[PDB]
Design a protein around this ligand. Structure first.
Ligand SMILES: CC(C)Oc1ccc(C(=O)Nc2ncnc3[nH]ccc23)c(Br)c1F
Length: 167
């Protein structure tokens, strides 16, 4: 039993809700919140900008030190950093950004990072400003993640479309 509330169950392990991931993280304080990161951990907009804003820019400060030490992530890769006031940990995961021409096949690799964590609060990878089809992202999520994932979808219209079209 966990503290996530109001989710629709899609499969044995995947759950979905129309919610602002920032507000959901603040309420649940999950062990792991997933960020929709880029390889430079520049949290300017989208989910990343919102999460970073909620940490009062502490996420960005920590991220800049991470990059200075380690260099950029790989597309499809991830790193574990602090969750600040939102979660114990933040798993920064880089899905391919279609608006940069990146290979959509890397979306499966990106979701594989979730399997290293028993339970996660997450957005749909490569959705929103990353330019992929969120219906496809949900399909890859369900077919790749085996651990327990609670998906927050900000847009109510998109949420209803994802549910109603789910196979
Ligand atoms: C073309 C348009 C429909 O694309 C999208 C628009 C918005 C979302 C969305 O709800 N994003 C979020 N989800 C959870 N927390 C969040 N905090 C801040 C944003 C946010 C998504 Br997934 C989209 F794909």
């Amino acid at each position: 039993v966990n503290s996530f509330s109001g989710y629709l169950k899609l499969t044995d392990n995947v759950y979905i809700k129309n919610a602002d991931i920032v507000e959901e993280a603040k309420k649940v304080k999950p062990t792991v919140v997933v960020n929709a990161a880029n390889v430079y951990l520049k949290h300017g907009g989208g989910v990343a900008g919102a999460l970073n804003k909620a940490t009062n820019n502490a996420m960005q400060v920590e991220s800049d030190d991470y990059i200075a030490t380690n260099g950029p992530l790989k597309v499809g890769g991830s790193c574990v950093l602090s969750g600040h006031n939102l979660a114990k940990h933040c798993l920064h995961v880089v899905g391919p950004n279609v608006n940069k021409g990146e290979d959509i096949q890397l979306l499966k690799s990106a979701y594989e990072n979730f399997n290293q964590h028993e339970v996660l609060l997450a957005p749909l990878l490569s959705a929103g400003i990353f330019g992929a089809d969120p219906i496809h992202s949900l399909r890859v999520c369900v077919d790749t993640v085996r651990t327990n994932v609670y998906l927050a979808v900000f847009d109510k219209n998109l949420y209803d479309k994802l549910v109603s079209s789910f196979l």
